[PDB]
Design a protein around this nucleic acid. Sequence first.
DNA 1: AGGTAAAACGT
DNA 2: AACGGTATTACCT
Length: 203
Amino acid sequence: QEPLAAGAVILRRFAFNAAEQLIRDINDVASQSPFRQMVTPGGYTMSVAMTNCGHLGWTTHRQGYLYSPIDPQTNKPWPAMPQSFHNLCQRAATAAGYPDFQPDACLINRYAPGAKLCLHQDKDEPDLRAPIVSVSLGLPAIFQFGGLKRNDPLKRLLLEHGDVVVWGGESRLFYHGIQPLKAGFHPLTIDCRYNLTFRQAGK
DNA sequence: AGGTAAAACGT
DNA sequence: AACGGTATTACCT
Ligand SMILES: O=C(O)CCC(=O)C(=O)O
Ligand SMILES: [Mn+2]
């Protein structure tokens, strides 16, 4: 438990032991709602490929960003959140000082070499102020963690296989991002990084 | 009036 | 290549 910011911590290798089962369950989720690179409202295709599980999934569409109970590609609900995901999230949130966290949304991110996620905020969903639990699997990536304003100084932190990052409270709306993924090998993911992002998006 | 796109090129 | 412009507007509700 290292102190990243007010209300924020990195739990290094927290999910290392859980990783093989997490990846099996990523493959199961994606067999039903495949990874897809989403198109921004402005018309650009994201380099990260995404899917979701749980009741609500993050998605783009023409009018903005949305949490949706239906996968717009399959027109079916997102797959149920795997118990391995829910258990890991709960254990990490508790260790980070958020024992009451009840996620209903898990965004699954797949990074090929070169893929990035530019600095952004996970904005508040209506009447909600729950933390974010973020699990890294596979190849290492440089995570940017800033402040409430885009130009606030960035911390740059390598996130390796099994690292969990949790933010909330005062740091809930902090800008953050992932720098372009370096090519490499990992025994469990082969050639990519995955990330699991747990949120409470629904009342 | 308040929130949201940019979770996306130039120096 | 780290930093910051752009949304300094145009829409929605
Ligand atoms: O891949 C990561 O570590 C961060 C992902 C993220 O910020 C997101 O999906 O909102
Ligand atoms: Mn995010």
